[PDB]
Amino acid sequence: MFEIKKICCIGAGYVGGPTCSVIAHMCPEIRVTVVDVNESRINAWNSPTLPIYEPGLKEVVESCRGKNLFFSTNIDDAIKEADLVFISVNTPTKTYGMGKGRAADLKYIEACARRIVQNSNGYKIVTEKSTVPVRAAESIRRIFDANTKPNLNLQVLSNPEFLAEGTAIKDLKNPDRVLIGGDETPEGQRAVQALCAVYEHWVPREKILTTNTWSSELSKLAANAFLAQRISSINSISALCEATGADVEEVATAIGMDQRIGNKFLKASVGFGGSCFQKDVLNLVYLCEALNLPEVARYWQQVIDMNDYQRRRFASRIIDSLFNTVTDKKIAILGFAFKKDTGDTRESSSIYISKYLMDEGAHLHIYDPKVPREQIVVDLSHDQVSRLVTISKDPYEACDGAHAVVICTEWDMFKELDYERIHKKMLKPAFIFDGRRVLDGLHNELQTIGFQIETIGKKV
Template sequence: MVKICCIGAGYVGGPTMAVIALKCPTVEVAVVDISVSRINAWNSDQLPIYEPGLDDVVNQCRGKNLFFSTDVEKHVREADIVFVSVNTPTKTQGLGAGKAADLTYWESAARMIADVSKSDKIVVEKSTVPVKTAEAIEKILTHNSKGINFQILSNPEFLAEGTAIQDLFNPDRVLIGGRETPEGTKAIQALKDVYAHWVPVDRIICTNLWSAELSKLAANAFLAQRISSVNAMSALCEATGADVAQVSHAVGKDTRIGPKFLNASVGFGGSCFQKDILNLVYICECNGLPEVANYWKQVIKVNDYQKSRFVNRVVSSMFNTVSGKKIAVLGFAFKKDTGDTRETPAIDVCKGLLGDKARLSIYDPQVSEDQIQRDLSMKKFDWDHPIHLQPMSPTTVKQVSVVWDAYEATKDAHGICILTEWDEFKTLDYKRIYNQMQKPAFVFDGRNVVDAEKLREIGFIVYSIGKPLDP
């Protein structure tokens, strides 16, 4: 029986390994983490992450061929294939601070693998890492060599939070990069055999290590660039009277462009897009390519601009001040169907409104009060000028209340900001909401989820991203 161990039981490690366990009943999968609370949650009915369909997959395999454990060393020692899916955030200090990937977690995982291993292993980069990381990992793994053969593969993950299980069941492609040596080819084949249990072989792409590592950064950069492109267009639409939905539809009909990822919004978020583009920017700079670096930087600048543009629109529409006014914030997660708030645009939008002394009443179906308070109190890292900005004062934090119902959030509110595209926001009783709000009642739809015309008929003043302004 092939034994797999995955170091890192997070948004990627957990779902990915659960699906491997489900699809490969003859493979034993152990997911290990240094976080005791995370592992306890994986072993309970309250999984540590919200992901549609995940409970079901875990329930089918846990205790059979899927195990969650904090005994990292034991499971690594016993494994034939070790996936490493630890976090690779942006460095906050030292060389490359604000841009480069922080590989501390990866390095310590690699050192541990080298120390505890007693048999040959395939070590798989599942985390998103800078191109050429495998070279560094190889050095660490082979440094203390006790005659053990380590083969490094790059197998970046392309799942999207909110649709992770669907994406893992039916991936557009699985990418495996490895050394072009007989041992490398054998290792690639071993990993291919795992995926071939459910992924059609023509969707398994094999490349050299550097192409695989760089492809993940490139894919995220392209996706984020598409969002910034349509968001940049949304600003122009508002200035000219064009409608971004109509423009996106027309543009997306071109088969060379395609219709996906063309929705205007308050901006992209999540733990990956910004971090991976910054990483790409840093790699370009290190390789003497400042113009290419500047090109990708602009994707983040437009994203930041979109968030501040939204805040400015809210404040200017509400008679140039939101001081003392109650704003209901509907949605805090960075997208629907996840409770993840890492880099969510809601953080910057809320901070912007709080800066003008608004009172916020926040509702998100999957994000806890603790999480929201923590996010709003956190220091923001300015990537262009690597200094820590001031955290919010405790008094400002008191301007925020978190409630568990959209109707509660909107009671007596002067305005509503929709920041996540949760389906339930489409079907709220907006007449009821209008009746309990201060007048004039404003809706600022940062995700274009509501029917603006219907809301205007009720009496709301409505702003939708990239759409002609309220007549």
């Protein structure tokens, strides 16, 4: 049974970086080399300051860098040496052509496949770790076969990432499961077992699941779809709550106490964000359309439609409360990141709430304690931003003479604001629109102060 001594990962992103650092950390006898075409990242990884921030990562890297962990721009050589090649390049959504806005672009993956076969000889296991569309491994095999050589035996595996950015290290050292898909043939099985062996250094064999390569690719998309579906389901319920007098936090709790349902991913909000949920559901939907499965496509499209409905519904409540006119009205936007405790704004609901309000000609004053100023301007551009967008240094500068305060990100600090002070300098009637249920418990307080406070999933 083949043993893996040298590993090359293509891509120094948040996936390939931490995963290989951990592998190096739990497998001192293996030489792991992370490469990327970006000289900036590579030199940063070998620098005292790392190009990405993860809790516990800095310690892992400094423990291994120089012994068995190496970051280089020399991709060709790292490929030649390696027994295992992780393909960890991103697959952006197509911005044009067939599948525009939904289909995954395999351009970078195909580039890796051609680069690998070019610079490699003998036996090598090639593993796709980045999120790929289903049957992408067929595409890789097809490149390998057409570009074959004597004594060339490249085995293709699937081993998707399941780490949430922010807790990468914890997710890697103590994963719920490791997933490995390979062809159900003697050759494919030997390659799967070799990859297992690497993980067996720190992952119990009970938590390692082996499947065929297509089940593995599809599992990654479906898992994210199921998670997203849970959120959109509780959100659809929140709309019912507002219409019936029920309360979504009460309903979520009652639902989640069913062992079969569980209590995770049931917190209603203005809408899910992030670079994964919408991207992977849209890719799942495109897959179904391509495979002549329109009933399944429209089933999963509902997850996205509900999320868009949730955001639009929220903006509409704000606009109607301000008498369907927001021209030149000051509106405080507290929180711009897609979730708390991060600077990431990718697919942030704040972007969509802000944009709806901008279409009304609102004067938005945006505050976020972590998100860089230049990022907010970028996320709101296509002139219009110049006229309507002010970026506040502090929350009180954003609520000074504002008609309404809109909370879009569940930052802990928003709970602790001096709402007595804020109310004194707001225009009356003064509104608070809680899009994250963060001011729950503070309702009676804010109302006696004088606020009109509205929130997701609670009847007005």
